[model samples]
Target: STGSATTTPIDSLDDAYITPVQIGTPAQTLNLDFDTGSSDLWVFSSETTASEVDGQTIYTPSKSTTAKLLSGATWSISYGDGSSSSGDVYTDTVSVGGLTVTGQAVESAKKVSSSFTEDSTIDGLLGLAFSTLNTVSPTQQKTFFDNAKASLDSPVFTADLGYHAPGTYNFGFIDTTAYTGSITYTAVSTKQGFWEWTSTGYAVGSGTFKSTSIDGIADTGTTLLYLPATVVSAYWAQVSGAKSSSSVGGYVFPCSATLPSFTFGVGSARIVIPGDYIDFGPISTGSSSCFGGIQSSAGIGINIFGDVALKAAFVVFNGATTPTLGFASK
Candidate 1:
């Protein structure tokens, strides 16, 4: 069967996209960050410390008849941004959009860092990446997508993220009407458990496409487009008064600057990102300088095609035995 759900950005800068998910027997609905960079479906729960509760929703396993504790099983995960959570594991019925998966492993957070507790917009995180990255101990657990793939009409999912508007995430089948032009398929390496792929090349604005290979991961969890310093510098050079600032912590430019569009290759297909998308937002409230969505990935180890880049195209995460990624302009 196919399932479709709408995802909305949490803030004006499109910091992160969240979708509603139902967990437990009575279906406790919670807005969760759908992250493709890691594999661990975790949520704030009754086990979480009261101080960490903040304004986020918490899952109460005891309230669900289907919820079964996994005994000694536990999970812990830390993100690149240093936010972390750890807790015991439970198996319960979980549903997203219209797709339901019985006996899905749900990590109940007993402890969470301030970063997570402070983000009141998201109640938890739903990982969509390969299950190999699951942090559960004793035995790794499968992600919601992995557990639901077999029951789906097609073992695939698509991400159609919007800039500031509501977007849709479709499971099982790709909606042909959601995109324009044929999709460009590329081999994916799941060794690292990410939707990792290599790009043919990139072009700064409308400049000629450089014939080179840039390896990167398509990560919905990340908020910005991170490329090599060379590429990032080239793109920023086109903007007036753009500079890599230490205080602002990234490449920033005048908010009123006429930003140039960015284009990247997917096999033979080239997807263009509008200039406005790169103007992430003002560096500070009512500040004249704005942060550039396209930043250097030198410190990140691997380039990342985050929401800033994905928002420009339709993306398919094919979860067959041999995984592949499909990109199409929309």
Candidate 2:
């Protein structure tokens, strides 16, 4: 089964690409979705199906000299992208910076699509996002963040991954600067433990969004600043050098050559995702083409602001207390 054959649009209706962070010293790259909705480390496996393609690297449990899968506790997960991978479950040693996370559960997808394929540099997902939205049970419903929190130094995990922007996968700290406004902490329901928040409106170009009527789940699981078409079109009007992109995705824009900068408002806090985040690297078509700020996911249920939007700010999930979701930096 597949969650979605096509991946969610990264930029303005573009494809969402992820980077993987391995454990300990030997750094391995794994492009993954930092999903907060569920807490699990899933990667493509070497024994993968030929038909299913994966953009990110696959972790072969038997191949990794240091890896270990827990017996035959195999499981499967499907993404909205319509791609699914199923394989054995096991605990492999992983590290984020000096912090070591051992005995962590991971899903090995033996049948991934080229859309989800990758090689050695890729590691796996660091799901510091959420576990509240899980539709399953209590035992099988644990989140990586909630499970790994005890091992972390500060119980804080922030994302600094950018559009082709190179930086050590951010670990153990929330760059309060990610949020610019007065942080508001929402209350969490007793039944669901995942930290949740609400968005008032988003800032586009020079105009600071006042009281926008838009509503969505504040999901750290998502990477881009996902919004409705009305918002995307509005921002596009202000962004200079902005064009249309279909492959890497989003409203194509010339970022490096003639790009502009804009800030996004999450409540009162302001977050910025530079134009380069739009045009990531030098490509033949747009060379500097990156995903658009807001990808078109309007009718696709609720919108999710993925990692691209998270990198430029500091965010905190206070699930411990009543402070479910809080923004710090801008």
Candidate 3:
């Protein structure tokens, strides 16, 4: 009953890290965005309108002998970015890497937002957040990881997200070769089904560290690092010619400007992002204006350490007992 699974990144999207999961009896594999910010394993399915599915693969429950309807159970989820999806539920076997979970809830989308329908590469999303965040109605559903955790050697998962390169998502075991240096530990507050933690403070470049508490979630599904307006302003101000542009939105700077490194803290653990990474590339290509990878969280309230901040390190999502976060350089 003790085992683990390691899945490599799919297609190598620099903005998001995705993994493949086999679903149903005969196994219909789909590339899913493994999101830690939300809970719901949903996919484009037969129930989805043909016109809305785009070029993505669709899961057909009737094709699988083990698929069973939950009987009136359904799910709907909306993202901070305004993307949304809604569907009914099916219970079936779901396998990731080599680990299998029987009777895992799979939400088959009957409707999706225009933003979702446009992304044809991702077939769905696999939520790794706490079961308390599951969107299924009538009764909350359990994630595949939750269903398989008891049989695992340890209730932990490691996300080795890379930049436009291959990365691995290991369940129940930490691969020592995936990271360097000692892993720093931090207490996590999961009151909101997020890997929320408070940073002791932060610094722009080599500037003096500001001793302020910034509470945020480590969200894998999101692409950019979202911080408070003040924090965002401070970071961008350190870069020459950087300003908040209403036309392009967010903070934009001269493409030639040399941005400074930004550092966030958790006790003695200081996570740093280099200057080059802060330049999110030229605005609309060929343009001299570049957007900052770090920006204000809009009106979303709490800050978010998204793919921009996460891909720089090896992250361990510790789910056993009191949830904790372990980070190390990759």
Candidate 4:
């Protein structure tokens, strides 16, 4: 009825977090990225082209007696970063941690982008966003969270992402020990198929808090924090050697620059992101300049509270009849 899983960053920069998932009759274990921004539970599989197969593990449906092809069903999705994948559909027994879901839609990847192929740390992705965002044609499928919610003690899941450390994804009930202080609850809008919410305002370092409404989505799949141009500029300006570089495609500064922490409001709660977390790794191998984890979302259409921001707080995705988001200090 409930489940808990350990998620680890793929690299030192925490580009993505991966958690183990078991699929099929005999249980084929695969490390999958838990993405709250998307809604398609897809995986690298035997159906993928040979040339597209890199160091990642592949799911062989034939090996699982429980695997049943969803004839005429297919799916495709492209991420904000332009990476994409397309696949056919299969229904199989899937489990995460100790929770089990029979006949969960398991999209088997037939083709994948070079970026995904090169990322050997993750074999697939488990989408945690609303099922309305599912890309499957003819018959859209529910996410694992949705299917498991009815059996869970509570219709909620929590994301406890960490900086350079392993975190946890807990389903059914909130682990009281995972966070500190009381959680601040806020209304969520699922109209866009995202865990979208409005932030009260922001403050750069120890500066004054700006009282303004900033609407955004809590996206676990995205790697960085993207806010309004003004907010991003304000943060970068505080850095002595920071500048927006066309060549670099974003704001970058000296690797040794003393960066200031970023703080955002969730109702009356304030979540502070450490300065070191904003000083993203170098632009290139051994580069003297480092890219900022916070960037302008002007071109992105909407702000995104990505891993950079999520890592600073404990996030709750409440899937009740009236969905809500809860944030707390951790």
Candidate 5:
């Protein structure tokens, strides 16, 4: 059998999309960010500190008959953007879309940092990376997809992310109608717990596609597309008033600039990111300057294909064999 979930963006041109999930015996529903960058199934719960709760819904495991605490097991995680959460472990029945998994590890947050607390819209995170990246102490936990994959007819999942719109995450099955044309597959090296691959090269606008190779990770949790500093500068150089912002800390350009398309090489297949998509709105509300969605991955060793890049294509994460990444135009 297969599982499917609707992942909806926060708003028009929003950063990330969240999927609805049900946990525990009584089935408490929460909208979770299905992150391909990290590995852990955690949620804000009654265990979270009162002051940090805000308007977010907390999962009260105590009220669920199926909640079973994993004795002495605790989990804590930190994101690249500084969002952090720590909690105890509980084994319960968790269901997403039409698929259900028994005895799934659910980490209920007891403490959350300011970044997570500030955005109350997201109740928790469901990691879709490799199980090896799980951070649950002495016994590393398996993600919902990992546990459920064993029972699935085909261990595959598809991420159909859209621009400022709702998308679907399909498991164990691929819907041909979701994408246009055939899917192009590429081998992925899972040395790190991410869906990382090396792009043949990239080009700005309608320029000749260079053949330079770069290794980057396909991350859904990240908000922007990151490339080498050289590539970033080359892309922004075409814009008139684009410069590195000291206050905003990223490259910003004139909001009205007619930005060109950017493309990433995937073997023989190429996924082109539209120019307007590169402009991540304004640096501040109602400003004539807009911050770029593509930034320099200088400090960060590896490049990242965040939402800005992923939204341009329909992605397939296959776990049946040596993990492979498949991409197609949506």
Candidate 6:
């Protein structure tokens, strides 16, 4: 039997990988959104007075037992998702599981969008995707990992969003002993920040992409994985009654039905994205099931694997090792 995985997109096509985030200096406990599409981790700060700041989680550095700030450095982000946030940039000692990274960068936004100011239960987002996709000051750094790289033992982070027993989403370093099967490591391409993303190709039913194989950067900034219409339509040909969710503005189908199992081949490693995840929010309209993975962020350029594909495999993204993402598993 083959191993499988699942993730809740609950948000949108640009949302997938998620991590726990909190407020205050000691860092409160709040399950935050982990974005790979964009950079800039922000939480509502005590300074916010905007009426728009409704459901968004607010951060209070003064409430934390151990928190510090960077006096001169400040940050703001306007996302392609139509959300914007502006705030101060600070640093603190972050403790995740048994790992601690000192001087971890954090953001406290005084003003945020209604979506951020309201409705989200988490404190802030974790911009742990890659530098190439970061949207911060100077616009050319790894955001979270760039500053703490020198302190981590492995400096690599892999996400486990299965919500199952096989593994839990972890931080700091990869736990090789967790998996019973052997794993392999692949060399990474050397590109700065956004260009830092690469892919050998993708496979549907053991098929490889043409030279024009959908190439895109891996993003933690955006949640839902965005694949171009060209490739998605090509993939849809394999599934039956798989239609686009025009009202929701993306693709969604009956997951309980027959769907193809696909995988993204990253060098020697085959990162799988299950069919169930594609129909995570299956809504029966007329007489068919609608899937979620086939989104219309086609103009966004580059196909995104998001959390569905990411949660399945053990990934090793290292920033301390010269700003390159290495793929390895147990």
lDDT of 6 by residue, 81-109 (tens): 68787777766655444445556666777
| TM per candidate | 0.99, 0.69, 0.94, 0.99, 0.98, 0.77
lDDT of 2 by residue, 43-119 (tens): 66566665554354656566566666466466666655565556666566654444555666666666654445543
Clashes per candidate, residues 3 or more apart or on different chains = 0, 74, 0, 0, 0, 34
- How should the candidates be ordered by TM-score, best one leading? 4, 1, 5, 3, 6, 2
lDDT of 2: 0.52
Could you tell me the TM-score of candidate 2? 0.69
lDDT string, candidate 4, 119-230, tens digits = 9898999999999999999999999999999999999999999899999999999999989998999999999999999999999999989988999999999999999999
lDDT of 5 at 10: 74
Worst 10 residues of 4 by lDDT: 49-58
The local distance difference test score of each candidate is: 0.94, 0.52, 0.85, 0.95, 0.89, 0.57
Whole-structure CA lDDT of model 4: 0.95
lDDT tens per residue, model 3, 1-330? 333344344443366666888999789988889998988999999999888989888889999999999999999999987899999999999988888889999999999999888988789999988999999999999987788888888898888777767677888888888888878888899898889988788899999898898899988888888988989999988887999998897899998899898888866777787777677778885999988889998678889999878878889999888999988876
What would you estimate as the lDDT of candidate 1?
Answer: 0.94
Task: Pick the lDDT winner.
Answer: 4
Candidate 3 collision pairs: none
Candidate numbers, best lDDT first, in rank order? 4, 1, 5, 3, 6, 2
List candidate 3 segments past 4 Å from native.
1-13
Per-residue accuracy of model 1 over 10-111 as CA lDDT, tens digit each: 999899999999999999888999999999999999999999989998999999989999989999999988899999999999998989999999999999
Off by over 4 Å in 2: 1-33, 50-72, 118-123, 132-141, 151-153, 162-164, 168-196, 217-223, 239-262, 280-291, 328-330
Between candidates 4 and 5, the TM-score winner: 4
RMSD of each: 0.8, 7.1, 1.9, 0.7, 1.0, 5.2
